[PDB]
Design a protein around this ligand. Structure first.
Ligand SMILES: CC(=O)N[C@@H]1[C@@H](O)[C@H](O[C@@H]2O[C@H](CO)[C@@H](O)[C@H](O)[C@H]2NC(C)=O)[C@@H](CO)O[C@H]1O
Ligand SMILES: [Mn+2]
Length: 529
């Protein structure tokens, strides 16, 4: 039996939860258990790869879109996958908005069933990118979920899915094995029998295992990769294609008076920013992987084609290592040390210590925070590194109780994914939504520009919109962008072949939940002969 050992996420222990709509689920639920209608290859310019749906047609006015369901597709329990499943799934999100992870309810007014295998989504507002948005909404089995009294707490321990791996062959607190859907519609293309998911708590436990060659597919941070991982075995390979932005997010509505006086001050945010030595952070914390990001808008040099150089040039200084500039700005802004501790107090003389959070176990982020704390001390800003578990880290953000948080973002073929997910105020409310836009800075015009991006197909018009977004975010120094990272990815050729690589760059190689292309990737693998 071919078992692919994968690590899409860390856990202190394995807790059986296969609900695709819950943040507490196992990260092998979406894609592998519940296959999407279409998987967009974001690397290749967002090209749709059709799976459960054979085709779709967006109406010319961009106010609706139809999807043709592939016939002959079955759930793991033998029942047919039809339009009823799709209709029910979005109806569920309407019934329980906390299960709405994309904020899709705002855009989709209704989801009508045209026929057994055809559904039509009607929008509340024009969005040519709705197909992509729809593709990220998990679709569950209506014949099963309609009998579930409360979907919000349903742990779905014995999942019925459309994906390649639905059989829970083994489940212990330290390991679970997800095997082949006995009724998989694409069985002929699946050459991996089981997904082996061992329990790993953090980067330290992961390093020990990966160098010992007991893992096949991973996307974790690995220090000194060449010496410690690559040079240790000819079967140890990796490929780090460029990815999105990473930055420090500040909470504009921190409940502490002193902290809010600091964080909700553009001059302080710029001074915080200038204190950071971005290159040293990349060299030290990331071992030279990644590039400096001195775009106040967080755009990133990779997307320079979308940048208005003038805007970049004007705020670039506030996003460049400059100790003197930082200290001079703080003083001019009225931030001074009035109690002799070497740290600046707020203009009204209040003391404060910024708690910078980064998830426990994410050592590359943890090290970045500590480096940042030390760099901030140099400019007189008091800070302390905190490493709460991801759940806590994430929660403190959805509830706005955190101070500052270092985080990465998802990355698409253009800056929209980043700008929209990291700034659309519509994504700042609602349980079930990620952390990305939870800084609580809001602007009507910004939201308007963002929401207008896919209302037109005119690239020159989209560029004009991009420029407008850039300036508003840059002008307000909403976050403190630091760098553009990469899709960390490590593969072992000891047991399987067919992996994506620089030589075979089929798309984002990550195995993390949220990278739907992982379904396509796993379907390219085959055990060694
Ligand atoms: C865009 C995003 O939020 N991606 C998340 C990933 O960062 C995260 O993976 C973890 O990222 C850390 C920071 O680079 C790494 O140190 C850590 O090793 C890595 N963990 C694994 C298992 O690869 C994943 C998993 O928590 O979630 C994504 O949402
Ligand atoms: Mn002081």
């Amino acid at each position: 039996r071919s078992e692919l050992t994968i690590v899409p996420d860390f856990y202190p222990t394995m807790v059986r939860n296969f609900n695709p709509y819950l943040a507490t689920n196992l990260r092998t639920t979406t894609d592998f258990i519940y296959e999407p209608l279409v998987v967009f290859n974001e690397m290749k310019g967002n090209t749709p790869v059709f799976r459960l749906a054979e085709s779709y047609k967006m109406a010319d006015d961009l106010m609706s879109v139809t999807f043709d369901i592939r016939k002959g597709v079955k759930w793991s329990d033998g029942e047919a996958f039809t339009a009823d499943d799709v209709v029910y799934s979005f109806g569920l999100l309407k019934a329980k908005p906390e299960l709405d992870q994309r904020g899709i309810n705002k855009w989709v007014t209704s989801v009508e069933k045209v026929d057994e295998y055809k559904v039509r989504f009607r929008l509340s507002e024009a969005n040519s990118n709705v197909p992509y948005e729809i593709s990220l909404i998990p679709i569950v089995a209506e014949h099963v979920w309609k009998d579930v009294k409360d979907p919000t707490t349903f742990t779905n321990e014995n999942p019925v899915g459309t994906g390649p791996f639905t059989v829970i062959d083994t489940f212990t607190p330290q390991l679970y094995i997800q095997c082949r859907n006995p009724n998989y519609w694409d069985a002929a293309n699946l050459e991996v029998d089981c997904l082996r998911v061992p329990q790993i708590a953090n980067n330290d436990q992961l390093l020990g295992k990966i160098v010992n060659s007991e893992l096949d597919w991973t996307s974790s941070f690995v220090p000194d990769i060449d010496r410690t991982y690559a040079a240790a075995n000819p079967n140890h390979h990796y490929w780090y294609p460029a990815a999105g932005t990473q930055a420090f997010m500040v909470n504009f509505k921190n409940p502490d008076p002193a902290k809010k006086e600091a964080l909700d001050n553009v001059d302080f945010r710029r001074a915080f920013s200038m204190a950071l030595d971005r290159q040293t952070i990349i060299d030290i914390a990331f071992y030279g992987s990644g590039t400096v990001n001195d775009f106040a808008s967080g755009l990133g040099y990779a997307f320079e084609a979308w940048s208005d150089e003038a805007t970049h040039k004007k705020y670039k200084g506030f996003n460049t290592y400059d100790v003197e500039g930082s200290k001079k700005l703080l003083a001019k802004a009225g931030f001074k040390d009035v109690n002799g501790d070497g740290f600046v107090e707020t203009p009204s003389g209040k003391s404060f210590e910024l708690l910078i959070q980064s998830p426990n176990g994410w050592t590359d982020f943890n090290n970045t925070v500590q480096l940042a704390v030390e760099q901030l001390q140099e400019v007189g800003i008091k800070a302390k590194a905190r490493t709460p578990e991801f759940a806590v880290y994430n929660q403190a953000m959805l509830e706005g109780t955190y101070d500052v948080a270092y985080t990465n973002y998802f990355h698409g073929a253009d800056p929209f994914t980043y700008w929209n997910s990291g700034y659309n105020s519509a994504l700042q409310s609602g349980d079930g939504m990620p952390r990305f836009a939870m800084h609580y800075f809001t602007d009507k015009k910004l939201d308007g520009l963002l929401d207008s991006f896919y209302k037109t197909a005119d690239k020159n018009e989209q560029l004009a919109i991009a420029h407008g977004i850039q300036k508003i975010i840059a002008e307000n120094q909403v976050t403190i962008p630091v760098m553009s990272g990469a899709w960390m990815y490590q593969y072992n050729t000891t047991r399987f072949t067919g992996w994506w690589s620089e030589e075979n760059p089929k798309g984002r190689p990550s195995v993390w939940a949220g990278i739907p292309e992982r379904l396509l990737h796993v379907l390219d693998l085959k055990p060694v002969k």
